[PDB]
Amino acid sequence: PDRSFRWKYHQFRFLCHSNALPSHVKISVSRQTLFEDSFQQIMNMKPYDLRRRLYIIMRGEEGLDYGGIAREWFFLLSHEVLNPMYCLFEYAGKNNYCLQINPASSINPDHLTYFRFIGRFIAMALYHGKFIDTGFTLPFYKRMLNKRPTLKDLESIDPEFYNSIVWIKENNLEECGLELYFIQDMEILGKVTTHELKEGGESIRVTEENKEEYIMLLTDWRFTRGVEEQTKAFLDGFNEVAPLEWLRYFDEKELELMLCGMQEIDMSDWQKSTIYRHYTKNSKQIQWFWQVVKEMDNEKRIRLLQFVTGTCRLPVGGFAELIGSNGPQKFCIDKVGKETWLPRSHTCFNRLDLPPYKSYEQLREKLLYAIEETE
Amino acid sequence: DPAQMYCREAAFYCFMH
Ligand SMILES: *CC(=O)Nc1ccc(NC(=O)C*)cc1
Ligand SMILES: [Zn+2]
């Protein structure tokens, strides 16, 4: 819970080792048919047999040490499931920003079995201590941990909808005549439907005395709308291989690290590709900021990268190629707020709202706290 | 890419064990 990431990791490993089966299973794939072979063979196994040693066979190749052939199969299949012909996923923003399940996935008639498969595969990666690069979002990880997505999470997947809900939260809708009811619409595959946000929501108007419950239910609906069955199929497939309850103690950032591996952060590249707003590279707080970063070990730097961008993954080009929800967006630090505030981030824009703190000590303390405790 | 995955994997194992 409050224990270190490394401690939680070893507890999880002990659960995995304590429940391993002997012998092995063979997965034989060809590279041209990676997904189809991987899908047929894995879905034709009893799920507990996937806890045995994995013998991955690239049909017609080398062999030797399995750590590297394991990593290549896990890596490549984690990209192949994104293949648009399968119709399983889509992206919230431009240029493959913010992966999410495609609500129209049922156009693939097998799509629930495909999601169950991806669940098994992701559990296999965790179980066998191997890493993937699919790009699931921090709220997708929250669901696996039975953490409710927050209002702040919305800003990562849907900046406008977030701003829209923030506006309602902060403003008197009765004063502006805003007409809202506890219902929402959704069109998928050209078939628009209506979901009541609670019983009788159709007629229940949103008032100042209603607002907080409305915001909550609307938030829940944005994250689950149209992807319920897909998400359940993913979760049941994962759970079949590795019980989801073994993932206790992790927060969603740690789970992302568990699945992605650990990125070494180049402080040089980071600093050469940061842009400022109101601040400049010579501002006192910006200098204090980079001194805090230099003082951080690599785990804290990753934690900060996740806090500001919403992910531990850097693009292959480094910090220069960093993408936001509306195109390329470099890491940005902006002078916003009071020194009584904590730093805040807008992950869709890779932006850190750094208040003009008066001392290195104050900035360092609030920054380390925010990274550890807030999102 | 594969190079980055080798790094991510090895750095993770070293951090943990
Ligand atoms: C690319 C890269 O940095 N790889 C890498 C490999 C191994 C380690 N291992 C330890 O530090 C013990 C770090 C990084
Ligand atoms: Zn981002």
Residue numbers in the entry:
A (entry chain A): 491 to 865
B (entry chain C): 1 to 17
Authors' text:
In addition to possessing increased stability and membrane permeability, Helicons are capable of binding large, flat protein surfaces that are inaccessible to targeting by small molecules, and Helicons have been developed to target a range of PPI targets in cells and in vivo. Characterizing Helicon-E3 co-structures and mechanisms of action, we identified new binding sites for α-helices on the E3 surfaces, as well as potential probes of the disease-linked E3, WWP123,24, highlighting the generality of our approach against this therapeutically important target class.
First, we focused on the NEDD4-like E3 ligases, which make up approximately a third of the HECT family. We next solved the crystal structures of five Helicons, four in complex with WWP2HECT representing all three groups of HECT-binding clusters, and one from Group 1 with WWP1HECT. These structures revealed three distinct Helicon binding sites on WWP2HECT. In all of the structures, we found that the HECT domains adopted similarly closed (inhibited) conformations. We found that individual Helicons from all three HECT-binding Groups (1–3) could modestly inhibit the auto-ubiquitylation activity of the isolated WWP2HECT.
